[PDB]
Design a protein around this ligand. Structure first.
Ligand SMILES: Nc1ncnc2c1ncn2[C@@H]1O[C@H](COP(=O)(O)OP(=O)(O)OP(=O)(O)O)[C@@H](O)[C@H]1O
Ligand SMILES: Nc1ncnc2c1ncn2[C@@H]1O[C@H](COP(=O)(O)OP(=O)(O)OP(=O)(O)O)[C@@H](O)[C@H]1O
Ligand SMILES: [Mg+2]
Ligand SMILES: [Mg+2]
Length: 1349
């Protein structure tokens, strides 16, 4: 090796020894270092074995022949030079390793081999170099090399084709080149360019990325962690995601090395402008190194993104499973908002970290490399500069710690907000009926303001950290130079170091974010590890032995939580098989607690409970999913028409199906809001009955149905002559009409078994229950999320800009422009201006500091803008959602509304401001580069348009697909939330019916759809990026080829920078365009039709408007949607002032539709209501709802303080609230509570019994107490003693106000002056109850089934 023949001569020729040693050691060596490592992948990852094909054999045979040929050389050498022995033998054995490797790759099922192809490429290049040398030299050993080269070339061509396999994702069958360049998606790219992409065009998820192949692994690792240990979530994380992620370390290291090597080649090339061969070889080397850098970096990015997506899938699945197995105490502790945050944006924090977590070691690697270069270029003086960086470590770290705390608080606040929103979604009908939309809007606004203040402080600290990190290189430069002068600096020596500082700045300009991502991910890990470590109920607590007493209990002390006192005190009873059991009692005595204790939903302090046989449970509050009635009754069961029809007919559900539009196939709504209370209860009971279980725990299944339907159901389903006659049945009921039929009656008083026996046994004991008995007192309703088809409207960008404000936007743009101008001036000053040294070295520092402050400036200007816009975008949304009518919440499932408030809002909060910042930075960088290359060589400006033009085209070609993918991702994420909500609403039902596995599979399917939408998005980013970077690399080599041909310079180092800036301007613009989809989806609800104006100023009623309360319907036809039949066809009532009127009728007749129409919840289809000579159709919405009270059918208590539930407006004094609780017969219960009125109600009020929730509704009705009271079955799930107490207080407090009472208990309506009988939506018997009884009509019959005659 000497420079005369290798570099100095115009003939590019290697030396003979170099040819025979290094050029042969390179490829053989590559396979030797990779071979061992490759067994790891070949072993850990398997896909079967490929069959015997001609291609595989062709490759194997050529591997055998190639080895022979190489050993044939050793034979001829055996037949002086030392290299003529070792080299042929080494090549032969590495060749024997190559053929063995394709053999084992066949065995392990790999169609395209990256190793073989790259290995053959390197061998080919080495052979090409020797080939050219051997053909320039000119039989004996040359012909062996020609044979070797031809065989190697054919082997390389063969290695490109993909072998046979052992809406599929093309990556599973793509060739090696296709996957290294992400070509397997280009088909969807052009498709997505001709028509908007839909979910149908999207490919099915890869097997490795599928939820049921990812979540289980994480669950198993977590279970092992808990078995061996507090359990550290981080441990299971890398024990679950490192085996695949660690290859990104190799890709990152290779990319770092080659991205450092590239600029060296650039500098040598620009120094070159020596014969033309040197320039051609240098440009080819730069080109191939750049292309390899892009490919390797981009595989690294794909690995990080796929690992992050798998992390999100695993986190969502684990959260779902834990929520399924969670205990009630932990479920109360970890609110629904917290679970929604964990599964919605907590894995987003992990997703981002994935990309930066491969930099935590890369940034200090380049930092220490530049530091060593500084040491060798300037001596030990640089250690002083190190000190500065050292003193920059704690402060930032300290701030990071502070930021962490903020994030924690921020996250906590977010949970609260989401939890509150969930309550608003669940009790929206009650919220609007009570005119409480404004109060809860203000509550959510206060929570959001607190959360945004915390986020603003966190953004301030992040801006300070970014500022100090951006000013650190310049301060280090100045400190090092000042220490160095006190031997002398050389103008060249001084400035060969300034560039090193510009290189070191890159890392110090990402640690600002790597730190933020790590802090957010650490907070997320903490929240998720705390959730996954929550106490879980065990099925082994209840000895659920398969099918001599069906249910036996021995001294059970069940408690809802360990901290709280036990609810069940010494429970002991034994129910024989097939025995009808009624659990009677007053409000809040643990009857539903007893049933949930038999379901293992209650923590057991001590006892022995054995429940034998399958359990079928019906919750007092019926849980209904979005599936139709047939799928609700089936509940994932095989359809048997003979039994399904019998169950439907027996449960008195047939007439409701007759009056339903599509019968039993019509969609039923997210929460059963389509159905009535009685129909909901009947559907839940029929679902339990159809599932043939051995034990049926029925909790008030006939409380919300009339006497006739209740008797029909009991005789045909529950009673001794019903379908359930052979099953043990625990019937928790308050009605005592069916007690004589009961085989065993258990009285639950104070939480314990006060009395046990039959009706004839308890009527002779002469006890408390004896006194109680003596006293006798398809359609497709829901609309799924829709993805917009087209460019996002510029109105969305305007909405995000006008929310930020003119001043903030102008200041941010000015600071961006000033920062990039200062940076350009500094860099340009260094480039051209190169004693003046200290003075110029000071200018570099001065401009540099002037840059950092501006970097700080917009960092504190965009972020606060992100606080402003998120403060507006949410508020309008919070307004837009509430102002929307009840029909909107009916048709929109509670996964779109949660999506806007959880994930799209999070994207608006944090992602969009940062992405806007990086878009403005890239755009101004491109403008500055355009100015730079315009001032220099103005003749080149002719190529300024077309260059940008082509880039523009690529940008367009990409967004037309990319947006849709993002849109589809959001549209694919809305259902998942819904499922969680549903799963969170009916956890007890799912656990009791043992349908946990089916719901787990449904959640896995929904997450699989979401990732089917999300994975093509990241693959699209990679594909676009490869092409964009390749465009640049083919303008670097091209400008380089052109410049070398026209040598006798900086057009290249200008062209490369402009192409890189344009590539990262296109990528950023695509990112901003995709992120604006979040604002588009938030604004989607703005155009949705809303309710009538809340307050009509002109048509305001008098202050004392309902003073008479003379409600007068004219016809008031009611139609929920303009696709169904009327439910209030031509009713004419003339309710007088202060008239006790009772709207009684059959279940599902339209009684509560009257109440919904009185409040203008549903606009009148035909007719009007003139209350006190004032038409409500004309009155303001609040002017109507604030002057009419209602006690809703479904008692919902929003999570929070009990006093907050009684009046969220907080306009009643605590003394008055105490009085209102006293007339509700709840004073004793609230007073024995440890927290008194500040008692925290659970999510949806589950902390209280439904009787106590009805009492709370009555108490808040007493609090309002206007001249119109609507009693929508207030006495529905309360005992007879409480029932009469409620009626007596109403009879007293509501004595001079018009009251419209809908009830199935006719004994509460005989005192009413006159009643409204409803059958199917028409005015039936109409008059005084005594007159109707004389008429002997339908009211008489209803009183007959009620036992009142
Ligand atoms: N939100 C809704 N959308 C569409 N149809 C509905 C809706 N709510 C109820 N219905 C239908 O209207 C009819 C009457 O329902 P409504 O709410 O008036 O019953 P109800 O009189 O309150 O019954 P119950 O006696 O059980 O309280 C039924 O056919 C029911 O399925
Ligand atoms: N999730 C919960 N957290 C805390 N306490 C609860 C919870 N669920 C029920 N309780 C308490 O259990 C007690 C009894 O509730 P349960 O519903 O069993 O009463 P009940 O007498 O059957 O009610 P009802 O008369 O309405 O049928 C009440 O003190 C209630 O507050
Ligand atoms: Mg109950
Ligand atoms: Mg009703």
């Amino acid at each position: 090796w000497e420079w005369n023949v290798t570099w100095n001569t115009s003939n590019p020729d290697f030396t003979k020894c170099f040819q025979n040693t290094v050029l042969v050691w390179v490829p053989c060596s590559y396979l030797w270092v990779c071979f061992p490592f490759y067994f790891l992948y070949l072993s850990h990852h398997d896909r079967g074995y490929i069959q015997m094909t001609h291609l595989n054999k062709a490759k194997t045979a050529l591997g055998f022949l190639l080895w022979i040929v190489c050993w044939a050389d050793l034979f001829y050498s055996f037949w002086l030079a030392p290299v003529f022995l070792v080299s042929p033998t080494l090549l032969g054995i590495t060749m024997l390793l190559a053929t063995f490797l394709i053999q084992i790759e066949r065995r392990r099922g790999v169609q395209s081999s990256g190793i073989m192809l790259t290995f053959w490429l390197i061998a080919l290049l080495c052979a090409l170099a020797i080939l050219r040398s051997k053909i320039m030299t000119a039989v004996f050993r040359d012909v062996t090399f020609y044979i070797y080269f031809s065989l190697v070339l054919i082997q390389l061509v063969l290695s490109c084709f993909s072998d046979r396999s052992p809406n599929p994702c093309p990556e599973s069958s793509a060739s090696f080149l296709s996957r290294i360049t992400f070509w397997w998606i280009t088909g969807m790219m052009v498709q997505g360019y001709r028509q908007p992409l839909e979910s149908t065009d999207l490919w099915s998820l890869n097997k490795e990325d599928t939820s049921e192949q990812v979540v289980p692994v994480l669950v198993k690792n977590w279970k092992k962690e808990c078995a061996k240990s507090d359990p550290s979530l981080f441990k299971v994380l890398y024990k679950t995601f490192g085996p695949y992620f660690l290859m990104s370390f190799l890709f990152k290291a290779v990319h770092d090395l080659m991205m450092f090597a590239g600029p060296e080649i650039l500098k040598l090339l620009i120094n070159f402008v020596a014969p033309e061969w040197q320039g051609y070889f240098y440009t080819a080397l730069l080109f191939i190194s750049a292309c390899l850098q892009t490919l390797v970096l981009h595989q690294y990015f794909h690995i990080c993104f796929v690992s992050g997506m798998r992390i999100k899938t695993a986190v969502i699945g684990a959260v779902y499973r834990k929520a399924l197995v969670i205990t009630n105490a932990a479920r109360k502790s970890s609110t629904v908002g917290e679970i929604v945050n964990l599964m919605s944006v907590d894995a987003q924090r992990f997703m981002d970290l994935a990309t930066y977590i491969n930099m935590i070691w890369s940034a200090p690697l380049q930092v220490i490399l530049a530091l060593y270069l500084l040491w060798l270029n300037l001596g030990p003086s640089v250690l002083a500069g190190v000190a500065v960086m050292v003193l920059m470590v704690p402060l930032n770290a300290v701030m990071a710690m502070k930021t962490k705390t903020y994030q924690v608080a921020h996250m906590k606040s977010k949970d609260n907000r989401i939890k509150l929103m969930n309550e608003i979604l669940n009790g929206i009908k009650v919220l609007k009926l009570y005119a409480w939309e404004l109060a809860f809007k203000d509550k959510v606004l206060a929570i959001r303001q607190e959360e945004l203040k915390v986020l603003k402080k966190s953004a301030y600290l992040a801006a300070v950290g970014t500022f100090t990190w951006v000013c650190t290189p310049f301060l280090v430069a100045l400190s090092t130079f000042a220490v160095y002068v006190t031997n002398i600096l050389d103008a060249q020596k001084a400035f060969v170091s300034l560039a090193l500082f510009n290189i070191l700045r890159f890392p110090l300009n990402i640690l600002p974010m790597v730190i933020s991502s790590i802090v957010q991910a650490s907070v997320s890990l903490k929240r998720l590890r705390v959730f996954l470590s929550h106490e879980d109920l065990d099925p082994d607590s209840i000895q659920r032995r398969p099918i001599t007493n069906s249910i036996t209990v021995k001294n059970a002390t069940f408690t809802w939580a360990r901290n709280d006192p036990p609810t069940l005190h010494g429970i002991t009873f034994s129910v024989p098989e097939g025995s009808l059991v009624a659990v009677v009692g007053q409000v809040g005595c643990g009857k539903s607690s007893l049933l949930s204790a038999l379901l293992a939903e209650m923590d057991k302090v001590e006892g022995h409970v054995t429940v034998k046989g399958s359990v079928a449970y019906v919750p007092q509050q019926a849980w209904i999913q979005n599936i139709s009635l047939r799928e609700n009754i089936l509940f994932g069961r095989q359809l048997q028409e003979r039994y399904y029809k019998a169950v439907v007919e027996a449960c008195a559900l047939l007439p409701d199906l007759e009056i339903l539009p599509s019968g039993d196939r019509t969609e039923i709504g997210e929460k059963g809001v389509n159905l009535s209370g009685g129909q909901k209860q009947r559907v839940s009971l029929a679902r339990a009955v159809y599932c043939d279980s051995d034990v049926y725990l029925l909790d008030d299944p006939l409380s919300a149905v009339d006497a006739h339907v209740g008797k029909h159901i009991f005789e045909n389903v529950i009673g001794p002559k019903g379908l359930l006659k052979n099953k043990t049945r625990l019937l928790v009921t308050h009605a005592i009409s069916y007690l004589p039929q009961m085989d065993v009656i258990i009285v639950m008083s104070g939480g314990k078994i006060s009395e046990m026996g039959s009706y004839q046994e308890l009527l002779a004991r002469d006890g408390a229950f004896a006194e109680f008995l003596r006293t006798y007192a398809t359609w497709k309703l829901v609309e799924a999320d829709k993805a917009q088809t087209g460019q996002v409207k510029l109105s969305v960008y305007w909405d995000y800009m006008k929310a930020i404000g003119l001043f903030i936007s102008f200041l941010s743009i000015f600071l961006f422009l000033c920062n990039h101008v200062a940076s350009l001036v500094s860099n340009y000053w260094l480039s051209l201006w190169t004693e003046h040294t200290q003075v110029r070295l000071s200018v570099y520092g001065a401009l540099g500091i002037s840059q950092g402050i501006t970097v700080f400036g917009y960092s504190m200007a965009v972020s606060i803008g992100g606080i402003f816009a998120s403060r507006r975008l949410h508020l309008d949304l919070l307004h837009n959602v509430l102002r929307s009518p009840i029909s909107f919440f009916e048709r929109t499932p509670s996964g779109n509304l949660v999506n806007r408030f959880s994930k799209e809002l999070d994207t608006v909060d944090s992602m969009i401001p940062q992405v806007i910042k990086m878009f403005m930075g890239s755009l101004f960088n491109v403008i500055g580069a355009c100015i730079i290359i315009l001032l220099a060589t103005p003749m080149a400006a002719v190529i300024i348009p077309p260059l940008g033009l082509i880039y523009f085209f690529v940008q367009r070609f990409y967004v037309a697909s990319s947006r849709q993918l993002k849109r589809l991702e959001s549209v694919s994420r809305s259902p998942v939330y819904s499922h969680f909500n549903e799963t969170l609403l009916g956890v007890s039902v799912i656990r009791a019916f043992e349908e946990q596995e089916r719901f787990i599979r449904q959640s896995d399917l929904k997450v699989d759809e979401n990732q089917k939408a999300y994975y093509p998005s990241i693959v699209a980013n990679r594909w676009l990026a490869v092409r964009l970077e390749c465009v640049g690399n083919c303008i670097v080599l091209f400008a380089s080829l052109f410049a070398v041909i026209s040598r006798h310079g900086l057009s290249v180092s200008y062209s490369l920078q402009v192409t890189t800036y344009l590539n990262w301007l296109v990528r950023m613009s695509s990112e901003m365009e995709t992120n604006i989809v979040a604002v588009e989806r938030l604004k989607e609800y703005s155009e949705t039709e809303k309710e009538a104006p809340w307050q009509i100023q002109d048509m305001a009623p008098p202050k004392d408007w309902p003073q008479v309360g003379r409600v007068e319907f004219r016809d008031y036809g009611l139609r929920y949607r303009e696709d169904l039949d009327l439910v209030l066809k031509h009713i004419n009532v003339t309710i007088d002032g202060g008239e006790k009127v009772g709207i009684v009728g059959r279940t599902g007749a339209g009684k509560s539709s009257l109440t919904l129409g009185l409040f203008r919840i549903k606009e009148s289809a035909e007719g009007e209501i003139i209350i006190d000579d004032i038409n409500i159709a004309k009155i303001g919405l609040h002017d109507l709802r604030f002057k009419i009270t209602i006690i809703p059918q479904d008692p919902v208590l929003f999570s929070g303080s009990l006093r907050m539930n009684l009046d969220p407006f907080s306009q009643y004094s605590d003394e008055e609230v105490w009085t209102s609780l006293e007339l509700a017969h709840l004073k004793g219960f609230v007073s024995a509570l440890p927290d008194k009125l500040n008692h925290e109600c659970a999510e949806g009020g589950e902390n209280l019994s439904v009787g106590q929730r009805q009492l709370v509704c009555l108490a808040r009705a007493l609090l309002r107490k206007t001249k119109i009271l609507v009693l929508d079955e207030a006495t529905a799930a309360v005992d007879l003693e409480t029932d009469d107490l409620i009626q007596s207080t109403i009879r007293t407090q509501f004595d001079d106000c018009t009251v419209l009472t809908i009830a199935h208990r006719l004994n509460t309506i005989m005192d009413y002056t006159r009643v409204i009988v409803l059958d199917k939506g028409e005015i039936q018997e109409w008059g005084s109850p005594s007159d109707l009884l004389q008429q002997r009509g339908l009211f008489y019959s209803m009183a007959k089934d009620s036992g009142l005659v």
